[PDB]
Design a protein around this ligand. Structure first.
Ligand code: ZN
Ligand code: ZN
Lengths: 88, 50, 118
RNA sequence: GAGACCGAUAGCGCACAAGUAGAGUGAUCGAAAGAUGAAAAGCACUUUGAAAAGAGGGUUAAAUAGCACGUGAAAUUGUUG
RNA sequence: GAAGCCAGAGGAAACUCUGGUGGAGGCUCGCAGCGGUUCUGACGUGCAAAUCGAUCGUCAAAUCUGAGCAUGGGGGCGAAA
RNA sequence: GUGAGCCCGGGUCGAACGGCCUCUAGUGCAGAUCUUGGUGGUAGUAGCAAAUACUUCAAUGAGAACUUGAAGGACCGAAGUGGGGAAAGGUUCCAUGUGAACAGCGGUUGGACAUGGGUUAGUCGAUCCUAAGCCAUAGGGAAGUUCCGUUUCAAAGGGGCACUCGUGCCCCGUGUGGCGAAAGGGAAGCCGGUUAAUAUUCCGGCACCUGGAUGUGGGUUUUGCGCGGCAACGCAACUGAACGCGGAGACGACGGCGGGGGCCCCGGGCAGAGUUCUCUUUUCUUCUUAACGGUCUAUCACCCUGGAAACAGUUUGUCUGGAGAUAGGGUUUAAUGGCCGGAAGAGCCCGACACUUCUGUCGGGUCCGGUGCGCUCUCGACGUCCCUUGAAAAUCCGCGGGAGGGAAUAAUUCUCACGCCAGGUCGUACUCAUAACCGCAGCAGGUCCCCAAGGUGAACAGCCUCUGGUUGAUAGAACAAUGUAGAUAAGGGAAGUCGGCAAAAUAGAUCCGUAACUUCGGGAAAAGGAUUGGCUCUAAGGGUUGGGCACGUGCGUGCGGUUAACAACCAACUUAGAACUGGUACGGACAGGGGGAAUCUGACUGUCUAAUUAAAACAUAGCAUUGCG
RNA sequence: ACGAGAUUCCCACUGUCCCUAUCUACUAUCUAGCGAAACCACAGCCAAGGGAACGGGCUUGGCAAAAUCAGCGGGGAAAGA
RNA sequence: CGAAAGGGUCCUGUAAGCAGUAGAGUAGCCUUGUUGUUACGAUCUGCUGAGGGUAAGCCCUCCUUCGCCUAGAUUUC
RNA sequence: AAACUUUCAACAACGGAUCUCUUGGUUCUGGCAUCGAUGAAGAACGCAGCGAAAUGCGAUAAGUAAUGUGAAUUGCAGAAUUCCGUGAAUCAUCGAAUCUUUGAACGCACAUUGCGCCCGCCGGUAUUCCGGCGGGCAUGCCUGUUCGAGCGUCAU
């Protein structure tokens, strides 16, 4: 009875949702995320999984601040306004 | 269950608002390639995974 | 007439906090009524007997009733029983009397020793 | 910026809402899928059907291009000889 | 139907006999539950990657069971297969 | 052209391509149980056969076995095919509409598809507490990711007072923070009505808890912080800091006994319904009363008098008493008991009018008893078992103490009554399974609980029924072989077969009777026998109430008596005996040991190879040895 | 004592057998609807011979007539063989 | 020819209902027992080899009733 | 003779090969140096008149300001633009801003939209009650300030 009949007893949850990475990988008893390694300060990553690194690497999300840095570098991190511009 | 946390209920609310077919005006746009909702969910078919 | 009932709360298990009794309503319907646990009589701190005159309530219900209902008008009233209070009084009196007697005997022995030394 | 490279089973897993859909408790695993036409001009109107559709009649240079859509092989199938 | 208890008959007494009372036990028949003995059983690309029927063991406890928690592969856990 | 191939015609088609010489390569396929994709024969075949079952009319519609209404017939049978939850799911819930796809047949139907709607709280949970346990801090390890550590080898902080040498002084000791339970602990809400879909959440009525402020009445005080009772203790109040003591929270399993609620059962009455060939003053249905309060009572226990052998009281169960019993009189823990408020105005039942709808309106009732080895929950007093003795914390209260604070300019710092103010956040739909969870599925598997009617019967056995649900699992016809499942068979009776495998036989209850062996407990229901229906009777086994004078005046005495061994009223189930009577059957279905003589083997109860082995295997109590101060 | 442990025997009992027969439900069957898979070099009547002890195809004979349905378990196929 | 019916032949075993100086006994009312009487009461007796079934693979019936009829479609040296 | 089976042909099916195409890969070369407590990368939840996704954005939410250009956007709806202009646009540029809940993540926690503390402001009858809003409160370390402790060394 190790198959179909035993499968009817599966109604608990080993993992809940992790607050840091959003996956269903937060071990509910150890309180440690199996994916991102929360609540350790560093994010879990290993060199034996290039695929796992590329799934979460920089550029796979939104880049809310980092995507604007090359333009500011190109204009030299200047401040102020164009001359004669309307405003205060 | 009836007992649920706020975070779980918020995720279920988002899934309910996502569960719809595409508007019919989408198919009439110029150069449209969207024919249906390819990520449509049903409660019997695919689990949310919460 | 439907005679079978249901729990009116979301706990479905027959635990010690899930006590019910059956009532018949003015609408003619059988129903449960969730009830609290029974109060426990306060007990004497010396012998452990139930203290007469004191109600048996759950602990926070004593904060809602007045002082004369929670006590007996006597020393140690509502904490110790009358027999134990009487035993305390007699024991205290007799032990203090014996202390005075022993002090007198010790003073007499000290005086006799001083007279023998002198 | 280029190539004596690959040309949708190739070339990156991904030319497409692809690290997506989907699977796994989890670590992880991980696809398939491009092409009407120059232009929607994507079939008015009539007719038969409950409808899907069919037949007339149309559009088009071509429907032997009908949103199953360029071309349209073979296995395999139907009709006719 | 174990200790304990009541009455009657004996016995110098200790004890003996008789009739009741009582309600012990990893006691017993047996329902649910738990388990899984047998059958030229059903099924054998099944209802099912172990299910179905009859029969059977156990059934007041070394009984059954939920949730929370602990033990992690050079390991654990093991009434030891 | 020997050939690999090359060239041309015809048809289709729509945008690029070829010859020659050199250069270059991811350059030539039938195989690799080759890779990916596509497609055959098998084949309109195997099959769509567990869970008893469907039928008639009408409507809808293009179309109806599997849509709906009505009419019938059935099933679940209260350990349900019922009414609700926990986990899990997440909108599956409700209304309206619907082509295809899906619902292994159909489909007008659907948990499908489309558009919308739906989840209302100071009182239910979460939130708070701590449990097993987990994680910070001090500090120590580790090259390091980090490991240990949770009271430590930590300067880890609270309170009070002060007009002076004004810029201080005094008191105290216990440590250390957090997370961790929608079943443990815990402040408080009930009834009626209402929606398509929510309701202890809305509406109406009636309440409660916690916290705060400040009044009025009442209380206390010129004997300053109440009075009464011998006492147990009572009463609406009736001061109480530090520091302490105690109680509650707060606790196992099992057995019988007693009380209470609810359910079940019996009788009468009003009203309604059914039956009515005959019978049936009939059979069935409604007849209810919440939280919150007031009041009168309810086992244990405790107090007073008094002093018991001729010992007494007393439980089903043998405990209690000069450490004070019995008796008599009291005090108190304990209500889901009686009466009253709530509250009849509600709910329910019946009737008479009105009514296009909107809408209703008005009458009559809702009463009185009884019973119990019944079922269920709850409470109480007992008892048994342990080399087992069966949580903690938050939180609340009482007391000891007597610091302060207190009156006649009246005072009040009164746990009494009434009054005033406030109560955030999140969950709340639905399923909980032969279709809402897991098993690739709408899978005969698996998955934690609560409520639980009538008859038979020992019985939540089997069988039949009420409430409430279903009538869903492709259908129609025929009745060959061989099957699967259920049965019977003359005569013989294990001749069958490796083997009595399988089937048959036995089976409930009352009574008679019961061997060897034995660890004296058992064996034992050993074995072997007699009986059991129906009807009409008889007998036995119970409860409650109630005694004569003389005075005072319904109680007090002083007497007198134990044939009340008597009357009146009330009540239920067992047991035994007898006659009569039908018979092929009488535990008439159902349910339900075959028995015996021996041998081997393991002491027994127990446990394991989930999915081929349940056993002489393992464990067990007992016994023996070794190490350790 | 206890045992779903292994063995021999006796009584009772019977379709185990002599020796088979009969009945019921569901299938199988036929119809409407729906509709797979395994497997498949090519195919399927035999006899004798075919040195390597093997023939289905070769040699020599027997023979041999469309298209089919229910069954069957010799052969070929068929055992996650 | 079909559907009924009637008669036969078979199968079971004496219908429903009514009645009875049959009935073990019990309880009332009075003549207090003289079938005393009335009531109830398994059963028994009579009406009653009665009632029920009978071809579905039984038999007979111009002469006991009612209905049906010389088709429709397909094919053929 | 038909049917059936098989062979050959035409047309029609089935299926998606072939050919041509390519806003994509792959490899080489050249240039450049720029993430984060001034809160990054990543995650979640939201935002359009009519969007589920992709894309863009953050309650100022398919965006605001500024500069430039100079008449669109477009699937529908609705409005334009004084066109001789502080001006369309899903435009480009981009120096000013906004930037929800989080996350190294920082009051304590978080399986809870749980529980606090400090200081202001506003409103509701309000010296006390209730509510809302704003600004703050992590750790290690450095420099400095200030308040301290110890017969540790001294002076007096
Ligand atoms: Zn994570
Ligand atoms: Zn005491």
């Amino acid at each position: 009875t190790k198959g179909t009949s035993s499968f009817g007893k599966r109604h608990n949850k080993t993992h809940g949702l992790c607050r840091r990475c959003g996956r269903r990988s937060l071990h509910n008893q150890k309180k440690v995320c199996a994916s991102c390694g929360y609540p350790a300060a560093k994010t879990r990553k290993y060199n034996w999984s290039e695929k796992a690194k590329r799934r979460k690497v920089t550029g796979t999300g939104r880049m809310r601040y980092l995507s604007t840095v090359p333009r500011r570098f190109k204009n030299g991190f200047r401040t102020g306004v164009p001359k004669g511009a309307r405003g205060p | 269950p009836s007992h649920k946390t706020f975070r779980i209920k918020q995720k279920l609310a988002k899934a309910q608002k996502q569960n719809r077919p595409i508007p019919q005006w989408i198919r009439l746009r110029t150069g449209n390639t969207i024919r249906y909702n390819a990520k449509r969910r049903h409660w019997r078919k695919t689990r949310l995974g919460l | 007439a439907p005679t079978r009932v249901t729990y009116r709360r979301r706990n479905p298990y027959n635990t010690t906090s899930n006590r019910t009794r059956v009532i018949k309503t003015p609408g003619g319907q059988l129903r449960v009524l969730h009830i609290k646990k029974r109060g426990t009589a306060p007990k004497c701190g010396d012998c452990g007997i139930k203290l007469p005159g004191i109600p048996a309530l759950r602990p926070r219900e004593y904060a809602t009733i007045s002082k004369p209902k929670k006590t007996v008008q006597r020393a140690y009233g509502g904490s110790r029983c009358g027999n134990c209070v009487r035993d305390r009084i007699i024991r205290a009196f007799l032990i203090e009397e014996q202390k005075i007697v022993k002090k007198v005997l010790k003073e007499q022995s000290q005086a006799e020793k001083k007279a023998s030394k002198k």
